[PDB]
Ligand binder design. Structure first.
Ligand SMILES: C[C@H](OC(=O)Nc1ccc(Cl)c(Cl)c1)c1nc2ccccc2[nH]1
Length: 258
């Protein structure tokens, strides 16, 4: 074994903590999540389940203050790529949305729901490949092929699905689909549509009344807007599922060169 190979230097804070760690010998870069301690114990267990190119990789943890060794994403947060009131070019948004769907399909396939999808939690590597990040709110919604309904209110209000605010229990998967829809809206409009999806929120009422001549909707082309009409559906049982998102016209529209 090579001496010093287990030493990592903390080179800079990534966000309050998360530190950029660089290996003393190989100079490999990883992100180290440092948390001063059960909620963290659940995060580690779920992270140990994960292995997908669009999910932040988990390398392991040191017990010691908990240390989480995570995939370093040098491109930063998707959040920062969104220009206020503008968004980003549609081809870039579609590519990010494809990779988001890939990561969410993977998590749902192993029975995990993230529960807080938003641009702050979608990170980018050196090639701007998207990675779903931070499973501190994640939980199991399917185990031994049996679905468990959720009831814990959590997430982030502008991104959260209406059923969470309205119903005692709800299916996990439609909630993640909804937040992905809000992320898509943010990417294409550079603004979030409403403070929260409540009947008291005027902007949300305007949407249910199909007033798409207003912002953010009028900034969005008809093709992606049509997908958003199928995702941001109030009734989670009527809301489009991911298999059907994969069949959507805009989702399959050639837009971006390699
Ligand atoms: C870093 C800063 O981020 C944002 O403003 N984030 C942001 C804006 C709207 C929404 Cl709805 C969301 Cl979720 C995020 C930024 N990024 C830029 C890109 C080009 C030009 C100016 C820019 N300012």
């Amino acid at each position: 074994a090579v001496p010093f190979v287990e030493d990592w230097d903390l080179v800079q804070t990534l966000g309050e903590e998360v530190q950029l760690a660089v290996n003393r010998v190989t100079e490999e870069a990883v992100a180290v999540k440092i948390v001063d301690m059960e909620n963290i114990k659940k995060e580690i267990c779920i992270n140990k389940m994960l292995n997908h190119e669009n999910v932040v990789k988990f390398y392991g943890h040191r017990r010691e203050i908990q240390y989480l060794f995570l995939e370093y994403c040098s491109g930063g947060e998707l959040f920062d790529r969104i220009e206020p009131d503008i968004g980003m070019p549609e081809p870039d948004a579609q590519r990010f949305f494809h990779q988001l769907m890939a990561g969410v399909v993977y998590l749902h396939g192993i029975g995990i729901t993230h529960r807080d999808i938003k641009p702050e939690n979608l990170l980018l590597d050196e090639r701007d490949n998207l990675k779903i990040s931070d499973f501190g709110l994640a939980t199991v919604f399917r185990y031994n092929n049996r679905e468990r309904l959720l009831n814990k209110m959590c997430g982030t209000l502008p991104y959260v699905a209406p059923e969470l605010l309205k119903r005692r229990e709800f299916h996990a998967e439609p909630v993640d689909v909804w937040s992905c829809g809000i992320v898509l809206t943010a990417m294409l409009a550079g603004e979030l549509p409403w403070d929260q999806p409540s009947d008291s929120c005027q902007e949300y009422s305007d949407w249910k009344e199909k007033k798409t001549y207003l912002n953010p909707w009028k900034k969005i082309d008809s093709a992606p807007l049509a997908l958003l009409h199928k995702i941001l559906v109030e009734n989670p049982s009527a809301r489009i599922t991911i298999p059907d998102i994969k069949k959507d016209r805009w989702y399959n529209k050639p837009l971006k060169k390699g």
